[PDB]
Design a protein around this ligand. Structure first.
Ligand SMILES: [Zn+2]
Ligand SMILES: [Zn+2]
Length: 185
């Protein structure tokens, strides 16, 4: 079917992450971001990817990895889930819950309760519908899901911490000339 009525959100800008496990380069993940749907949340993520406020994601780690669930990163101040901050302050409100965690590869803000978005985020590796309405969804992996899967399956300890650090060796913004809708899947 042509699915005119099933068009999802528009990708308005992209972010890339070049990842490492230990000292091994493992490839690039490209995330499409929904700047019409959640502009404030997208703008934060993009600025943290460029580093333009003087802090951000470069060389931070994915400190929590749960196979068949998600990979979590963005704590560039403490690397352990205790830190991070947004470009608006330590915390900012949940912008909206228009988007759901539709399937593998959706990108959503980590939080410690209502209105506690900072810099931490997660990339789902399955549909995580139980987070719908609680975590703000703002992007989807468009390229390099296989690289996400490498992280997903890295050995972890009993605290779900990778045994070897998984780091964002490089990151930045990629402009999108014409925004484009993707499927909610
Ligand atoms: Zn080595
Ligand atoms: Zn939660």
């Amino acid at each position: 079917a042509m699915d005119e009525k099933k068009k999802g959100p528009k990708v308005t800008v992209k972010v890339y992450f070049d990842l490492r496990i230990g000292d091994e380069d493992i490839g690039r993940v490209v995330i499409g971001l929904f700047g019409k749907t959640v502009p404030k949340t997208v703008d934060n993520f993009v600025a943290l990817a460029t580093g333009e406020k003087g802090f951000g994601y470069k060389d931070s780690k994915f400190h929590r990895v749960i196979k068949d669930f998600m990979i979590q990163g963005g704590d560039f101040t403490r690397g352990d889930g205790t830190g991070g901050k947004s470009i608006y302050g330590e915390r900012f409100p949940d912008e909206n819950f228009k988007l759901k965690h539709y399937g593998p590869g959706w990108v959503s803000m980590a939080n410690a309760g209502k209105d506690t978005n900072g810099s931490q985020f997660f990339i789902t590796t399955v549909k995580t519908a139980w987070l719908d309405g609680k975590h703000v969804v703002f992007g989807k992996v468009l390229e390099g899901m296989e690289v996400v899967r490498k992280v997903e399956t890295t050995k972890t300890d009993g605290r779900d911490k990778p045994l070897k650090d998984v780091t964002i060796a490089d990151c930045g913004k990629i402009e999108v000339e014409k925004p484009f809708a993707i499927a909610k899947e």
